[PDB]
Ligand SMILES: CC(=O)N[C@@H]1[C@@H](O)[C@@H](O)[C@@H](CO)O[C@H]1O
């Protein structure tokens with residue numbers, strides 16, 4: 001139960017995550033939604049992405065010393081959304097300028113010469129639908145690429161090609 | 172006009188469904204949701220489940236000569252909802268007394284023993300929530316076991332037992 | 343056997359009911375009858391009542407979004423008994439405890455400071471009489487007031503006074 | 514600042530309630546609120562209203578054999594809010610569809626052709642305010658009239674008009 005019409009999100013407890021120690025709140029409602037990639041390994045099964053989420057999060061917690069996996073939500077090619085910091089705790093995905101003002105959903109893998117399956121693009125869009133439903137996102141939310149906000153190669157050539165197609169994508 | 176925010180469904184193309192030849196339309200809103208099991212093999216990868224999807228569909232088309240897979244939606248252990256007949260077409264699944272007034276969803280497997288995984292339960296609940304938001308189901312909706320409406324073990328002793336707890340289950 | 347001889351009931355057809363969508367049934371022989379009032383306006387001609395019965399049903403299925411008027415029968419100040427959900431299908435007129443084990447005859451009007459005409463009192467005792475003969479009520483059924491099982495004023499102060507008189511009444 | 518800062522609810526003990534035997538739990542935050550009226554006599558002294566609260570409570574516990582007064586909270590014309598079964602316990606006030614997803618506040622008296630004092634109206638809105646402050650009510654909660662969800666005259670045409678006025682009132 002993560003309040004009405006919330007498009008199937010795999011809870012933290014389910015992907016065996018460590019406890020977030022993040023105390024910073026996100027002044028709701030969020031306007032921007034920054035899309036990124038982990039540039040890490042990709043996975044096509046629920047089984048292997050729950051390990052992959054673990055991988056991404058321990059690297060953020062044990063090694064870089066943050067309080068939690070830096071993204072608000074991680075997306076798998078297995079077609080599911082893995083819950084990271086969720087809708088309320090502030091992200092660490094795009095720099096001081098955007099972290100307090102936007103949500104970061106990141107696709108799990110490297111997308112320079114690989115495209116993500118439709119099942120995971122479907123997942124992402126359906127995450128945003130529920131975003132609005134709960135009111136964490138403003139019906140009129142804007143979708144920028146990681147490129148758009150920071151000197152970075154991510155989300156990756158082939159996915160920056162597609163997110164551009166998305167109705168809410170602002171230039 | 173009225174979709175608050177829906178859910179993520181694997182459309183027929185993606186699972187490579189034979190063309191539907193059904194024409195009987197279900198009258199909107201529907202009031203009854205009937206939960207059942209295919210009592211066949213289970214699957215936890217999006218790849219195998221797209222296969223299992225074709226299996227149920229074809230045994231129902233090439234052997235029972237029905238116009239399409241019997242269910243409206245199919246539920247995978249992969250955590251995904253597969254599109255069968257959808258929200259608009261009557262689809263053979265619980266007797267002529269119930270087929271025209273209920274939507275039939277079916278977890279893919281024999282849950283006589285085994286419980287389906289949390290993500291499959293989420294996949295289905297989110298699916299009904301989408302139904303209400305789309306206006307295809309009514310807020311009122313009643314979930315019913317396959318066994319409650321016709322003489323069979325069908326939801327599965329252990330799955331039936333779970334759906335008894337759900338918010339909307341009536342006698 | 344021995345023609346039951348009690349049907350002076352106006353059919354769902356004759357008063358123009360919307361089609362019912364209810365399917366849950368009662369087990370005959372049924373043990374309790376619960377008397378309520380519609381607390382709305384009363385009618386005295388068979389023309390004005392078919393109007394009232396259509397109206398009550400409208401408020402049950404259009405407003406509350408119910409499968410059909412919740413009462414099993416409806417008595418009119420016209421002297422006639424109106425088919426509601428009938429002898430077999432389970433009504434929705436007194437809570438989850440009594441609903442499954444009782445008939446819900448309700449007088450159409452507000453009997454707080456009125457008495458229902460004798461011709462109605464008589465149609466009611468007649469109905470119950472019929473129920474015993476068809477076998478739908480136990481020879482020795484128990485009558486009860488709506489207020490006896492719910493915090494309401496139904497079936498009206500003065501009518502409640504009259505039914506406490508009836509031979510099949512029980513606290 | 515922002516602590517609880519709740520209103521003033523006369524506790525059970527002060528009005529000498531009988532021991533609550535109810536055990537079911539509402540799961541906060543609650544989305545719905547239903548406004549009823551006891552449809553009995555009103556009161557305007559904290560002393561006389563404490564009298565009423567026990568009446569209602571005994572009719573509910575020893576006549577209907579219920580585990581506590583049906584309502585969660587009782588508004589009084591003395592200007593105090595009388596604790597019924599509280600913010601946490603499933604109340605019995607509007608059928609099995611709404612009792613588990615809502616909180617029942619009932620104005621002590623009968624408001625067919627009588628408006629409640631401003632005192633009252635302020636007590637009940639303070640109660641709701643307090644209720645969001647505590648996480649017991651969802652911020653975007655909806656208020657419905659009793660009759661809006663059950664065939665009943667309650668809360669009274671007068672009070673019903675007052676409450677469609679309220680923001681949070683829906684359908
Ligand atoms: C450790 C590291 O640098 N990770 C970055 C990642 O954050 C993203 O910017 C990606 C874009 O292609 O490049 C990666 O190298």
Ligand SMILES: CC(=O)N[C@@H]1[C@@H](O)[C@@H](O)[C@@H](CO)O[C@H]1O
Pocket residue numbers: 208210283322323324325326327
């Ligand atoms: C072939 C066969 O036995 N089919 C039954 C089916 O009719 C139903 O009873 C179902 C209930 O779960 O179990 C199946 O095994």
